[PDB]
Design a protein around this ligand. Structure first.
Ligand SMILES: *[C@@](=O)([C]S[C][C][C][C][C][C][C][C])C(F)(F)F
Length: 530
């Protein structure tokens, strides 16, 4: 019932739990991977862990990083919220735990960089850990805590991404203790999580922390956000303003923030949440700064152009109807109204802050005319968001990568319309196809919503998909290929783009993109190099 293991900084006691079927795994949750960013540490890079004595309780996840969840609703059930959220959770096939190795999976959770967690409410390791692999999830600093940017020495920006690097390093040292191979770590993420993963993959400061990666609906340059420096300044100076600060010196603004109570910050960020919908702060291209681990030293797009991350083989995913999943919140913020008021919302934040005055204008035009003929309306935006924020970015990445003489790349389109869909349930949705985050649910067990359901062996259609999806994930992390028959799901070829169409459990098929998809590509290409 109580399992014990040693880690570099001390002993920890996890729990022996059940995976699908009879399978069992040791599970250590809430383990600290660094000093908690609590005082003068709130926004600064994570400090090393003072060692501890006795056995650290790694029975369950710890609290969740300060945030305001404008999306998950009851799907996520945090055991509390605190700035002392920097913990990871490690799950391992019981038989594999050393007592004097396995491939490991590090997962970065989505939530627009502003909310979410690495908890098992949404991230159940049950399916995965049933495939002979170690699963590692964790929390990183969110919204203002992890992405504030003062282009200063104390807050150069990207603290959130640094937390990931800190944890990937912690994994390198501690992998063996769990019976895992640090030489075979696979990084995965979805949404902001996937975008962060892609970004790390371009960071020379993350070299050697993982052998390959999985991008589930997210990329370093996906349009749903921006790494633009001007924008950072804007939103930041807009926060400090709204928050009552008046100081101007980078450091002084900092101190005031350091001494500000959590709640005052949470309210001030929830202010921006109202203004932008589902995100607030973001990663930024940073300037070199004194004694600073530069996570991002350039525009992702230009970095990629020079093959800056082409040696990390990866799986690039995206769903059928990505943004159908957001309808409920699109209404709450009333995007239709917002669009009428800000016709630039249709334009990638990255272009608005980069392109030239007349340029923007014309694009702003083009975009509007493109999805809104008779009237600015919901479905029109949902189309926009899906293509622009997910589908386009994914395919454009598959293509660009396949023609840079780099590592392999596998592209997929999740279109499976499950019998049971947690997110449509919680939000009362109704649409065809697969919306954003759903493929993630056939790889992780949504423990906060399932019951005592048994998924493996599969019997219903849905569990069969669970089996198939989690198999692509473990094969990749085992053989750097999502399939055991190289021809069932071929690497991406530039001369012939095709994606594995995930739709029916146990049926392979790489197909070309539909007409619209091709049209969307061209359209979006012309727009991006206008
Ligand atoms: C995921 O991390 C994707 S983040 C997408 C945020 C922008 C969506 C459009 C907002 C328009 C107002 C997750 F879904 F957040 F988890």
């Amino acid at each position: 019932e109580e399992v014990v293991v040693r880690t570099e900084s001390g002993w920890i006691r996890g729990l022996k739990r059940r995976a699908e079927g009879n399978k069992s795994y040791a599970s250590f949750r809430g383990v600290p991977y660094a000093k908690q960013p609590l005082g003068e540490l709130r926004f600064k890079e994570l400090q090393p862990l003072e060692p501890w004595q006795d056995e650290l309780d790694a029975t369950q996840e710890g609290p969740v990083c300060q945030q305001t969840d404008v999306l998950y609703g009851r799907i996520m059930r945090p055991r509390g919220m605190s700035e002392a959220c920097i913990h990871a959770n490690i799950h391992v096939p019981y038989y594999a735990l050393p007592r004097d190795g396995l491939p490991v999976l590090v997962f970065i959770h989505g939530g627009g960089f502003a909310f979410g967690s690495g908890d098992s409410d949404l991230h159940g390791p049950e399916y995965l850990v049933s495939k002979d692999v170690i699963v590692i999830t964790f929390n990183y600093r969110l919204n203002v805590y992890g992405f504030l940017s003062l282009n200063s020495t104390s807050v150069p920006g990207n603290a959130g991404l640094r937390d990931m690097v800190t944890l990937l390093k912690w994994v390198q040292r501690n992998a063996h203790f769990f019976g895992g191979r640090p030489d075979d770590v696979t990084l995965m993420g979805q949404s902001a999580g996937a975008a962060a993963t892609h970004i790390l993959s371009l960071s020379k400061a993350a070299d050697g922390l993982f052998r390959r990666a999985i991008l589930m609906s997210g990329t370093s340059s996906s349009a749903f956000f921006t790494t633009n420096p001007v924008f950072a300044q804007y939103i930041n100076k807009l926060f400090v303003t709204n928050i009552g600060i008046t100081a101007t010196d980078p450091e002084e603004i900092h101190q005031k923030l350091i001494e500000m109570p959590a709640e005052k910050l949470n309210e001030a960020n929830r202010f921006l949440l109202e203004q932008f919908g589902l995100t607030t702060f973001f990663p930024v291209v940073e300037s070199p700064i004194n004694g600073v681990t530069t996570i991002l030293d350039g525009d992702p797009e230009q970095l990629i152009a020079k093959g800056r991350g082409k040696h990390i083989p990866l799986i690039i995913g995206f769903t059928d109807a990505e943004c159908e999943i957001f309808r409920r919140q699109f209404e709450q913020i009333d995007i239709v109204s917002k669009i009428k008021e800000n016709p630039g919302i249709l334009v990638p934040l990255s272009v608005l802050f980069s392109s030239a005055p007349d340029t923007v204008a014309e694009i702003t035009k083009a975009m509007h005319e493109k999805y809104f003929k008779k009237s600015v309306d919901m479905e029109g935006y949902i189309e926009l968001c899906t293509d622009s924020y997910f589908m386009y970015p994914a395919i454009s990445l598959a293509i660009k990568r396949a023609r840079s003489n780099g590592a392999p790349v596998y592209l997929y389109q999740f279109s499976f319309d499950g019998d049971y869909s947690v997110f449509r349930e919680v939000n009362h949705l109704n649409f065809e196809g697969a919306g954003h985050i759903e493929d993630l649910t056939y790889v992780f067990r949504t423990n906060s919503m399932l019951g005592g359901h048994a998924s493996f062996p599969p019997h219903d259609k849905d569990d069969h998909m669970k089996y198939w999806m989690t198999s692509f994930i473990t094969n990749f992390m085992k053989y750097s290929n999502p399939v055991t028959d190289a021809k069932l799901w071929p690497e991406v070829r530039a001369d012939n783009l095709r994606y594995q169409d995930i739709d029916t459990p146990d049926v392979y098929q790489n197909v070309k993109p539909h007409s619209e998809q091709r049209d969307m590509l061209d359209f979006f290409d012309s727009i991006y190099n206008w």
